């Protein structure tokens, strides 16, 4: 049994790391938190410092409001009984206002008003966290990749609960907040649009989702296999290619006839993943707005 390098054999702690400074306002960075010996077997042990500016707190307030609004409703349904609350936890659901009210904000709370309220809160929570994702990068001088990639996730979300409800003229087209109920919605959606297995965007989204698990399995396993030559130091292997980068490229070239570079593999990676929610959001956006039934559409594309 040679060492496989999935868990560290020996942890090593030094002075807490307060990070690079660049242009970050350090007034907003918290203090280094504890050190997890548990986490440290797999990755970093430092639960060190989080930055919290004005966007960060806007995000955390809105996020909790959304989370609490759904929760007090769950208790109302549970009859304030803690045993029933815990029993029927996955069964509770905050449902959208019925089709009658359309795209209006005039529905009663015990009939979808709470849904609008929670959604407004989730809306500000998500876009402010996105802005946070951009600004945190600009402070450090880094490219905006993480922000662009996050936009693709926002796309699907944006379509499921906002854009497509508005093109259908009703808030009842949106997803309810609930564990079992948001699943039933998903099943119901495919059924009502003539089976999503016929949506050519759904099957593309699936290919990318599958391909993400394939790619990361490939990449992760490859960096581990060449970590005996310092493979994980990816940025330096980009600026000054070592034998880690070469052996990695060569494994794959000898296997499938082509290969990536150390930078290039991360371009493959960001795109494979990004196209999951990109293609997915287009396929949902078209469902019920332009195509009523994907079986029918598939029979005579048009």
């Amino acid at each position: 049994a040679e060492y496989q390098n999935i868990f560290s054999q020996v942890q090593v702690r030094g002075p807490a790391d307060l990070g690079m400074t660049e242009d970050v306002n350090l007034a907003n960075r918290s203090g280094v938190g504890p050190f997890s010996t548990l986490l440290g077997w797999f990755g970093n042990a430092q639960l060190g410092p989080i930055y919290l500016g004005s966007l960060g707190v806007l995000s955390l307030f809105s996020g909790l409001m959304w989370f609490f609004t759904i929760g007090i409703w769950f208790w109302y349904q549970a009859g304030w009984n803690p045993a029933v609350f815990l029993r029927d936890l996955f069964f509770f659901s905050l449902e959208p206002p019925a089709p009658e009210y359309g795209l209006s904000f005039a529905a009663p709370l015990k009939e979808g008003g709470l849904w609008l309220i929670a959604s407004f809160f989730m809306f500000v929570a998500v876009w402010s966290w996105w802005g946070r994702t951009y600004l945190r990068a600009q402070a450090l001088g880094m490219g905006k990749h993480t922000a662009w990639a996050f936009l693709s996730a926002i796309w699907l979300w944006m379509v499921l609960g906002f854009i497509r409800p508005i093109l259908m003229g009703s808030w009842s087209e949106a997803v309810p907040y609930g564990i079992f109920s948001h699943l039933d919605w998903t099943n119901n959606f495919s059924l009502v649009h003539g089976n999503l297995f016929y949506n050519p965007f759904h099957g593309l989204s699936i290919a990318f989702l599958y391909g993400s698990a394939l790619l990361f399995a490939m990449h992760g396993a490859t960096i581990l296999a060449v970590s005996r030559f310092g493979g994980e130091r990816e940025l330096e292997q980009i600026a000054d290619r070592g034998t880690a980068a070469e052996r990695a490229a060569l494994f794959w070239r000898w296997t499938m006839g082509f290969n990536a570079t150390m930078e290039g593999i991360h371009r493959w990676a960001i795109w494979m993943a990004v196209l999951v929610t990109l293609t997915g959001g287009i396929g949902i956006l078209l469902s019920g707005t332009v195509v009523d039934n994907w079986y029918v559409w598939g029979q005579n594309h048009g």
Partner: protein
């Protein structure tokens, strides 16, 4: 035919079977004994599929489909035209995959690297083998397996699914989706992080792995690090396919009713089974 740095790595040795007999390349491709084994198994399978296409009367790939023996044949043989072509192709596919994995182990040895890749591939091979071999054998007929066609195999997914109600409610299937969605979140992030460090603004210098850790700590108050994120990705992925295989090996065998109803063990727990109010009372 060679990368600028390639020649120093193309030395003799590392093969598992046959010595130096198959120790060579064709263009970029390494051969080896299992390179030969893969071609054999792949050619046979492709020939059997073409011959299965003539019995059907299409050469359209969107129509072609090779079905298992029907349930009547059990775990026994079947005439080629109605079951046996599938059964043999399945042996030819299994043979192509295992051979391919073992060919990766030989490429590993010549390059002096770890075995993580073959190891990871063997999880995909295992998921396939669950659907076409393990679950069929436990159930009692090859007919429970899936058909080799582009859309017909999707039909099998839909019909196997709905045999048990909304298949969302398979709890092992819930777990597998989590890893799938999480593994893609992680892949988006890892790729974006390295690229934002490698490609900063304007005429800024190349950032460092320190900036990468700072960025994430800035953002969510933690950063797992470069060794870690590669250990994570390998794990989320392999975990997703592990729970996938699991959710199917239990469906039709230990559980064969509607999956939604399994969740009544929870709601009929005696402490709260009868208490009025809620959804289930």
């Amino acid at each position: 035919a060679l990368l600028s740095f390639e020649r120093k790595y193309r030395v003799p040795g590392g093969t598992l079977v046959g010595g130096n007999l198959f120790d060579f390349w064709v263009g970029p491709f390494y051969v080896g004994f299992f390179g030969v084994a893969t071609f054999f198994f792949a050619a046979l399978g492709i020939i059997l599929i073409a011959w299965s296409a003539v019995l059907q009367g299409t050469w359209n790939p969107q129509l072609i489909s090779v079905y298992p023996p029907a349930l009547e044949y059990g775990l026994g043989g079947a005439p080629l035209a109605k079951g046996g072509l599938w059964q043999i192709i399945t042996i030819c596919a299994t043979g192509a995959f295992v051979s391919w994995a073992l060919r990766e182990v030989e490429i590993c040895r010549k390059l002096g690297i770890g075995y993580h890749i073959p190891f990871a591939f063997a999880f995909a091979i295992l998921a396939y083998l669950t659907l076409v071999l393990f679950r069929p054998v436990m159930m009692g007929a090859w007919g429970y397996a899936f058909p080799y066609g582009i859309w017909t195999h999707l039909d099998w997914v839909s019909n196997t699914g709905y045999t048990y109600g909304n298949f969302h409610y398979n709890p092992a299937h819930m777990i597998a989706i989590s890893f799938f969605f999480t593994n893609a979140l992680a892949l988006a992030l890892h790729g974006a992080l390295v690229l934002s460090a490698a490609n900063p603004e304007k005429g800024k210098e190349m950032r460092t792995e320190d900036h990468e850790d700072t960025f994430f700590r800035d953002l969510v108050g933690y950063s797992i690090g470069t060794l870690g994120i590669h250990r994570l990705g390998l794990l989320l992925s392999l975990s997703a396919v592990f729970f996938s295989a699991l959710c199917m090996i239990i469906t039709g065998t230990i559980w064969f009713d509607q999956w939604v109803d399994w969740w009544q063990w929870w709601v009929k727990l005696p402490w709260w089974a009868n208490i009025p109010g809620g959804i289930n009372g």
